[PDB]
């Protein structure tokens, strides 16, 4: 694991592979790091240069950082990719990392970012149960309750050892400060855009987006309708038990990313 100072903050990352073409850039969700992509990584790096990126405050340095959100996540990873002289690249973002993935796509254009894959991101407007949990993890006294309740629904009774180990053992060293911030940023993201589908339609020059998921349940039909209206959009339900398709089904998700890049 290596680090750079980007925008005055410490960004940890991983740089593997030398195949030519667009670079895979992995972006995790809130309160976990590039180990979310340990399963996919052998397949990704065999295919393309692969850069796994941590968010600010998520690297080995677990000091509390200044408050930040989606605009900073985007500017940090862009500044990192500029420093690494990465040209065109394809973000792979887990759940609400997709908000930053889309902000990055929107900032650089379709030629510098020709595709984006998103993993298990709520595509409807935010359910009220969700918003309720986004406020419970902002609760100093009961943020742990909120997390366990989010986690338990993310697992959905799974037996997949990789997903179990990642949630139980591989996301330590975070607390109220980061979980409350995730509550703040995810809540404000739905409040501002309505939904990530609305977020996508606001892209001036939409690149190729693919949403890969196992958890929403409502509707694939909302996806069919979105794909039928926008040729740049695709999607695939994976059939996994969990909220973590990249960890539960790493080869299949990698195959999807390699497919998405091939098309674009």
From Swiss-Prot:
Catalytic residues, chain numbering: 243 (proton donor/acceptor)
Protein name: 2-heptyl-3-hydroxy-4(1H)-quinolone dioxygenase
Keywords on record: Dioxygenase, Oxidoreductase
Catalytic activities: 2-heptyl-3-hydroxy-4(1H)-quinolone + O2 = N-octanoylanthranilate + CO + H(+)
Family: Belongs to the AB hydrolase superfamily.
Induction note: Up-regulated by PQS.
UniProt-listed InterPro entries: AB_hydrolase_1, AB_hydrolase_fold
SUPFAM superfamilies in alphabetical order: alpha/beta-Hydrolases
């Amino acid at each position: 694991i290596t680090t750079k100072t980007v925008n005055g903050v410490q960004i940890a990352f991983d740089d593997q592979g030398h195949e030519p073409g667009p670079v895979f850039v992995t972006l995790s969700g809130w309160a976990h790091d590039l180990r979310a992509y340990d399963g996919m990584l052998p397949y990704l790096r065999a295919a393309q240069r692969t850069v796994r990126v941590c968010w600010r405050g998520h690297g080995p340095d677990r000091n509390l950082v200044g408050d930040f959100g989606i605009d900073e996540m985007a500017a940090d990873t862009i500044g990192l990719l500029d420093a690494l002289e990465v040209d065109s690249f394809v973000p792979i973002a887990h759940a609400h990392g997709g908000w930053a993935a889309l902000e990055i796509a929107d900032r650089l254009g379709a030629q510098r970012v020709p595709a984006v894959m998103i993993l298990d991101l709520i595509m409807t407007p935010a359910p009220r149960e969700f918003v309720a949990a986004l406020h419970g993890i902002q609760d100093p006294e009961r943020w742990k309750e909120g997390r366990d309740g989010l986690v338990q629904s993310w697992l959905a009774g799974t037996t997949n050892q990789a997903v179990l180990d990642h949630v139980r053992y591989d996301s330590g060293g975070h607390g109220f400060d980061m979980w409350a911030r995730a509550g703040r940023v995810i809540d404000e993201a739905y409040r501002t855009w309505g939904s990530p589908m609305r977020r996508m339609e606001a892209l001036a020059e939409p690149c190729a987006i693919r949403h890969v998921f196992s958890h929403p349940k409502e509707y694939d039909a909302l996806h069919d309708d979105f794909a039928a209206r926008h040729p740049w959009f695709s999607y695939r339900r994976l059939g996994g038990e969990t909220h973590f398709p990249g960890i539960e089904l790493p080869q299949q998700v990698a195959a999807e990313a390699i497919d998405l890049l091939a098309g674009a």
